[PDB]
Amino acid sequence: MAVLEIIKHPNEVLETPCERVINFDKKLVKLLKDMHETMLIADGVGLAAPQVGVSLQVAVVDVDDDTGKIELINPSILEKRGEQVGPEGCLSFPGLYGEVERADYIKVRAQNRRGKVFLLEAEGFLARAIQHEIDHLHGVLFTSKVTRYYE
Ligand SMILES: CCCCC[C@H](CC(=O)NO)C(=O)N[C@H](C(=O)N1CCC[C@H]1CO)C(C)C
Ligand code: NI
């Protein structure tokens, strides 16, 4: 493993929508493994590939032990229901926090390391984290959805 450098907002790679993953290869596996530990070391509950300088639709979330890490490749949100309002920060904007409204329930379709397609349903905080990461894969930063920044 390697502790990847997390890209901060002073950077164009953060707004570049990502390309889909095509070759589910060893290098993709190493990317995910390095991302998960790098994320955890930095106290994040999620991380997207553009945050480590890679413009591929790859992300990982790990908000609870039971659930555990959930790697997402080429994810798309098939459905959303209800809404939730709450505080969000981002590893690419250290120190910045704002109020953000997201869907409460989400149904997601994504691929694992071997390219197999699975279906995941989430809600509350895990659904928020997932939406935040999926935004990153499309070049969208939370800053564009902040209702107000906190004092
Ligand atoms: C909540 C939405 C998902 C956030 C994902 C980010 C990591 C990230 O930037 N991913 O792209 C994170 O872990 N953010 C943390 C965060 O926002 N937290 C941690 C506790 C709850 C919330 C408080 O704002 C801190 C590290 C800034
Ligand atoms: Ni972020």
* Method underlying the structure: X-ray
Whole domain around residue 1: which residue ranges? 1-151
Which atom of ligand 1 has the smallest separation from the CA of 92?
A: 9
Q: Residue 18 belongs to a domain with what CATH number?
A: 3.90.45.10
114: region left, alpha or beta (phi > 0 left; psi from -120 to 50 alpha): alpha
Residues 6+ apart with CB under 8 A from 144: none
Our CA angle for 20, 101, 104, nearest 5°, is 75
18: annotated binding-site residue?
Answer: no
Tokens of 87: 């505080």
32, 31, 124, 21: which is closest to 76 by C-alpha?
Answer: 21
Ligand 1: does its nearest atom lie under 6 Å from the Cβ of 47?
yes
Catalytic residues: 133
Structurally, the chain folds into a number of domains equal to 1
User: Residue 130 contacts by C-beta under 8 Å, 6 or more apart in sequence?
Assistant: 46, 61, 70, 72, 75, 106, 108, 122
Residue (of 80, 70, 77, 78) closest to 126 by Cα position: 70
Q: Which residue has the tokens 């935040």?
A: 132
For the Cβ of 6 lying below 6 angstroms from any atom of ligand 1, the answer is no
Strand 70-88 and strand 58-61: the pairing is: antiparallel
CA distance 72 to 108: 9
Specified resolution (Å): 2.0
